[PDB]
Amino acid sequence: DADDLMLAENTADEDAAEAAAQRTTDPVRMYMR
Amino acid sequence: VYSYTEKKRIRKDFGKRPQVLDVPYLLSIQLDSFQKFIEQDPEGQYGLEAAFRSVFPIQSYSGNSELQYVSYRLGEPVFDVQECQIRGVTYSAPLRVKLRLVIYEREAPEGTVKDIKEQEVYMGEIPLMTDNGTFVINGTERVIVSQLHRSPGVFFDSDKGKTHSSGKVLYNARIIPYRGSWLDFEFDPKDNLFVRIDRRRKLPATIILRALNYTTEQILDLFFEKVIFEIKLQMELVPERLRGETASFDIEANGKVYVEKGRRITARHIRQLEKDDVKLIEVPVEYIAGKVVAKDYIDESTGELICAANMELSLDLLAKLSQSGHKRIETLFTNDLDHGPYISETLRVDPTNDRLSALVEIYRMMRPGEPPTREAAESLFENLFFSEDRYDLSAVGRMKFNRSLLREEIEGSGILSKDDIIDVMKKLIDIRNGKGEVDDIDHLGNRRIRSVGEMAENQFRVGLVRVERAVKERLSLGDLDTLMPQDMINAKPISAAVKEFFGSSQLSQFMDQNNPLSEITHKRRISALGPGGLTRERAGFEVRDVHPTHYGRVCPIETPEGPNIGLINSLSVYAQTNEYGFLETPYRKVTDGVVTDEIHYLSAIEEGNYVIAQANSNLDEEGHFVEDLVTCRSKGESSLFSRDQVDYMDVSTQQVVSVGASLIPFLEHDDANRALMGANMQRQAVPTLRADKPLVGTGMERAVAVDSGVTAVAKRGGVVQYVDASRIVIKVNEDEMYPGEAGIDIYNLTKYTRSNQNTCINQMPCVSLGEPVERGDVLADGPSTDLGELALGQNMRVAFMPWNGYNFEDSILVSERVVQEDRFTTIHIQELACVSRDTKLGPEEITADIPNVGEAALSKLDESGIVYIGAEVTGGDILVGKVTPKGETQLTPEEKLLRAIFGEKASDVKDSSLRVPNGVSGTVIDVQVFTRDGVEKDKRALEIEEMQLKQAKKDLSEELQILEAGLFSRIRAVLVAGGVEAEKLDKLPRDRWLELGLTDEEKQNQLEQLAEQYDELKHEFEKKLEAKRRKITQGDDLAPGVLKIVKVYLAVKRRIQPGDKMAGRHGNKGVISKINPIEDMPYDENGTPVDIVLNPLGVPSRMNIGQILETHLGMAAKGIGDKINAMLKQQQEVAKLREFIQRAYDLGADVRQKVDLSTFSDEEVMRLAENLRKGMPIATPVFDGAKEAEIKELLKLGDLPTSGQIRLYDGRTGEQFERPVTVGYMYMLKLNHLVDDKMHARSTGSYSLVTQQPLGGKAQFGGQRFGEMEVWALEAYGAAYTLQEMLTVKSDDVNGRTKMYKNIVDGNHQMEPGMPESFNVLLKEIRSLGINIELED
Amino acid sequence: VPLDGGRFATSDLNDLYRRVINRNNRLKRLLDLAAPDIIVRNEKRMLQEAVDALLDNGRRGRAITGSNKRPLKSLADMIKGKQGRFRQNLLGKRVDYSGRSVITVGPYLRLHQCGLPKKMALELFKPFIYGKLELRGLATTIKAAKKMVEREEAVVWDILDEVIREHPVLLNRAPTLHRLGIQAFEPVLIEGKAIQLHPLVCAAYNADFDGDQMAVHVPLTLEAQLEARALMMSTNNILSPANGEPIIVPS
Amino acid sequence: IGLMKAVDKFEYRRGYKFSTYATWWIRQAITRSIADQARTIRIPVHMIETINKLNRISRQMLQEMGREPTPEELAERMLMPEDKIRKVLKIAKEPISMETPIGDDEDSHLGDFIEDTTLELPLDSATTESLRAATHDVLAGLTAREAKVLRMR
Amino acid sequence: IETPITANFREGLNVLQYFISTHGARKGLADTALKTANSGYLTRRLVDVAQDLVVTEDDCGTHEGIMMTPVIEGGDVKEPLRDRVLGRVTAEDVLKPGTADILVPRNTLLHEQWCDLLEENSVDAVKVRSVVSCDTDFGVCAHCYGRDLAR
């Protein structure tokens, strides 16, 4: 979910080089892991 | 014959076309829906029964205990509607349901039960609908508008190649359930089928097939056909299949010849092949090199899979299979053009090989970041669909699903099955291959109507499932005895959803109460917004447009203009909702040739496959179509059809328009834009002091007025036995009295009540003592109704001419005698409240002694500090006197010196009293006091309670004694036979009526029963009186911290003035510019001035020439009225009066109306003539109006010119205007845009807290927003100083604005500009981050 | 801030600061107990998340919501957007000495003057009237002047007529598409509650008399009055600025 | 935190399966933390318990009698002077978010309609200055010793 | 649609003709709303890009400019030289079409009289100073702009 949102945010960056070149970030999922 | 209320004033009716179907009850959607919601349905499928059946019974884990639902009921509301409105509380009924808890024991899961406990549990209060279609939620009257949402089912759409430059169109099928997840299919540019559950990441379609336990061979069997071969190497030829061939090898049958190579096989070749019975042919080996094997063909010798199913068949593979003995093979038949390969490509891309992998991929898709568990994935898949608890394909959903796939079973399961998904996939493939067509999303056969009685059910079910989950969790632990089925249920979880839907919802909004029309048209309104519906940000176009399917169902004209135009529509006149929620409309059926008289209600989809003749189609006297060819509308278009191939006909000419747009006369002559504006404005008219029927109408006035609910309509016929400004007592006829009733009805009228728009709601009787009535007659016409007809405006004498620039753009010039006669004077009632609270320093007090008031403003206050009722107050006067304690307030030096010099003490109390707002001036008509339970009830409250108790006792006593009079009258009537006493009956007193001696016959039993009924009335009266005293003398449930409230009602009377907005019914609005003296207005040769002057230049550009025709017809009608008035003043006998009225009532070309005065008694004729002396009302149906020749004829009946134009003179100079002008009578409206509600000025006031800017709005005495475009405008000029003073000193320069004020009051116009507050706040906010933003010097 | 009753209203920054401080104090307490590294790592991740939400909420992860189940406004959200300090309050804001009302024709006027209601004129020019009353000796202090204008005595209207004599007022209509949507006129005191607008200027405003409204502002300083008289007067703008053609043509 | 406290105060002599000596500490810690840092205007622990008890009694009464409990009935059923009940009911609940969209017409927020009640009106400032001027004028109309004495006191 | 509305408003429209008229009117209203939405965004961008331009000099002294000639779309002329040249400053001497002498020397604001003179002598090409070829730094000069057009 967060990874999907992060990817969507990165895609909108172009509307460049950094985004083109470019875990879950949830503090609870990492704690569970 | 005519109705008694209708024979007082008969409206002359043009409209050749006859009427076959009466207009239905206008506001029926609301009442039907809510009736369905709250109703004991034996086979539970509607309302609360359905929800309870769906949820209960609830089973705990392991089935140790079961909670069951039995029945439900609604208790009577504690407060009635009026008391709810007064008290500011909801009108609702409490829901009490009989639950039953059964506890089981080990070894008997369903056998012997340990114990069963029954109990009634109360779960929430449900608001009730008033008998007009509204809800009283917090004292205010709400309306819940229907919703137009896309119905559940399966819909096949495409993108018509919008996103692709290749021009290819990607089809996609979507399955929408009533509640659940959207199983969505689609294509891919590479012709790869895909499926996206819940619009999540795309997956290959075939995965789901495997998730349904399908093998590859089964998939290919389902979606593809096959061809076979025999061995040598002989093939069984099917002539039909080879529609395109010869690319590899033409034919080899019987050896000799069938067709040559190269030439493409044609139809004749297939005909020859079928004639010759070709069943075996030979083909080269290389021909099979391109085919794909259908099933699995293992090396039977070695048990090794040579080629898996759906794999390219090569010559080496042919050799291997032949060595294996596979003399026969199956290859998927597929021709590129028609039977394209699409599932095979999906298989090529399939990342799964078995059910487990598919389930794992689905599990990852649905919930990412989770470990794929073998047990969890199957459960998730089987739970997503196929479960009654998480997925519902409603009965309408199932009906449309089956109908779309072309099945025969209307009914079925609400959960998807494998067959359904396979059939949807096959349908999508068929659409893509070129067979079939896509669906239209705006077709009203695909859109459904939700109504309050269904949305309330949905919200209640949400609450009920929440409570079910809670009770299941509670039962999961303990399961002890002595646990009644009432401690696990709390009302609040269920009541929250219901009260939130009714209180704060998109579709639940304050009612419009400008006039009856606004209410009627607000109740029958359809909205595409709301929960489950699209939003304005991304809605149109192509859903805001008018569709051919709206004909007869949704009005094309009436729609709001603005951000949401086309998203909110109005139900047409005859439109009705199907059993499934689809709009339908009536059509009069046509047999072989005759237009029968039985109507069938057809729906959008069902209507397509007929041809329906137009309503304006001539019919013979026998019922046949006169014209050989008749214009009728087929599937989508309209054209001429033979007289013998029409199977339906429109039921009316107003069938297409709504109620609002069907009240515009001469709508055919108005442009669509102007008709839209005219309807929208007609909804806004303000009721005036005295109602005035339209001289030119359409005939829909009476229906709107009666069905609106603002009138008092008789429920039974009788004779008016008492009339008064506040009640009507009717004495029912013997034919409708019932066995044991007194037979008298009492109608209590609403007098000077406030509406949601702060207007007056006043009912006044229109009957007289001894006047007969019949059921359905109006007894007391409400606001904006005149003798039962809607009357929104006034009939004004108008002239179309310029007149000196005082009607320049859209301005209106009004005479001063329109203001002397109070024709547009309106009454506005407003409420003001004064809440006293308990503050930290002490409680606030309501008193008549206020600090530093010179006793001049305390005159109108009584001893208790509240204004006298009936007092006339103006702006600044005190209504309720209040004081608030304050702190020390250290006095500055100098003020201390002033106090010392003049020896004055500190007040110690503020003056937070309620006073009339500035610019208002009215009279106090009502005061009511609310006090906490534990307070002293100051003298005024006790006085109000005393008068209220007196009124209650008086009402009950009057009821009881009037009913006693009726009962004793009926008893005396019965005492005429069967032991009759006539001379001696009256001697003994009335109290002995009950003890009269009579023969041993049933009549004495009847009298005894009536006496017992009277005793029952006595007991009921005493009980109700005691209960009402208790209800009056109690406390109140006020907010926390408020000690008491005082509410004062002011009745303001607003006269028309320059700046007020006026309008007609044809979209012609304007603003009054001048009130001209009577001797300055243009006049005709008889000296009669003109009330209003309008600009003719407004008519050509705005092509709404219906106002000119209305003006001509109003002139004609007023001419007839003036002739009747002249004959009546001269005291002419009834013979000539009757002859002239009869001559006037039969004009035109074969009009439908026929009124014969020979059956009118002289009294009836004289009353009719006296009601027609101000003009004969005229009806001009919407698309069946009066022709111009008829207008000329009606003008000629009066002595008026047929041109419609007369010669006028100038009041100022007396010289005649050249080129005569058009005068007539037009119906003018006073829209609710009054200048005294719009004038606002500010010098200085209160400022906002966080940012020190002037507050906003007229209520807060706010300023004007000076935006960015105005800043650009001031920059275009070199106005740097004006811009600076507007940016800093006038807005948020805290210490610069006080200096500016002091400078101005010192006669020095100079400013020290300074720095605004917003920039300082911005610096502090940017600095509150890690940034360091400073102001370098 | 306390609202009427026992209720309160608070900004979303208090919640974010409270979360940051709670997690920081909890971490400080935790580092004294010598807890397992799992716990301190989780605490530090939470602290980073809370500071991130405070500085900018809804940019790295999910936006933290409140009781009303809406995303909380952060420090960054108070600067950006069409509803931020940069746009909503710094380039356009509400103003004192302003009013609005419906417009009527008034065809008797001259091109440089408008019709202003007596009530609006009395409300907009209150400090000027106080100054005049005190200067002419009619009132002793400013409180006496306030009471005089509040009772609307006879001298008050003569003083108002004297104040208005040569004092332009700027009239503006809401869709200000070009610079001729603001113009300065000289008031003429009238009865009623509607503003009378010269016909020839309507085309400049694109104004019709079927219900439109106009806003009126009053320049205060000497420089502002002179700018209105010399730059923005209606008799100075008779040519369109886009081309050379007149924009005062009879309609 | 509660678990780390238990693990330090746990002994195997009793034989309580940890999942019985530990849940108590976890529940205590979580409940106390909720009662200490869950609402902006902090309410003591005992008052939180009183509010919860009042809510439970109100729920029971609502289910039983059917309509609603009133403060008098609540006091009777809860054994309180009927003023403590009102005081507890008058607690300020939870502050309204100041950004709650309330305009519904231009995305206005609740915080745009709250006025600054401590600002001094511009007319009162002018009145103060005028009073100062009047005092200065009058105090110059008496012997210098009197003026000095009055300015000194 | 092939079949037109054969009725006017003096005569009435029947139900079908009015239905088609409604089809048209709804779209008209929606298009008006959309146009008002777009024309504001364009203006906002145009102001943002070119807000800080100000006349900040009297003459940059440049000798370059645009060559103004009438606009012709194949056949007739739809904008004479007077419209395109009135109110500008000549960048070079306007030699008479006979090449005799200078008709308009230089740096002369071309008002109505000069335009009438040019029309009389039938010249169809002038060299007028333009903003896009101004030598001023951080702004524009009054001679390369022209005249106010509002004063």
Ligand SMILES: CCC[C@@H](C)[C@H]1CC[C@H]2[C@@H]3[C@H](O)C[C@@H]4C[C@H](O)CC[C@]4(C)[C@H]3C[C@H](O)[C@]12C
């Ligand atoms: C024979 C006709 C009967 C009818 C005219 C008589 C019989 C009973 C009378 C009413 C009742 O007394 C109750 C009220 C008494 C008040 O004092 C005056 C009003 C009140 C409605 C009465 C008016 C009228 O007089 C009534 C209807």
Ligand SMILES: CCC[C@@H](C)[C@H]1CC[C@H]2[C@@H]3[C@H](O)C[C@@H]4C[C@H](O)CC[C@]4(C)[C@H]3C[C@H](O)[C@]12C
């Ligand atoms: C969509 C707009 C919501 C807004 C209009 C609704 C939502 C919650 C309502 C407030 C709260 O109840 C708290 C207070 C209760 C007091 O009794 C009256 C004031 C008070 C602020 C209420 C006024 C208003 O009713 C509010 C702001």
Ligand SMILES: CCC[C@@H](C)[C@H]1CC[C@H]2[C@@H]3[C@H](O)C[C@@H]4C[C@H](O)CC[C@]4(C)[C@H]3C[C@H](O)[C@]12C
């Ligand atoms: C339709 C928009 C409603 C809006 C105009 C009404 C509805 C509720 C009103 C606010 C609430 O009462 C809460 C506060 C009460 C204080 O006493 C004055 C400020 C306060 C914010 C009120 C100002 C305003 O009056 C509000 C926002």
Ligand SMILES: [Mg+2]
């Ligand atoms: Mg307008």
Ligand SMILES: [Zn+2]
């Ligand atoms: Zn230059």
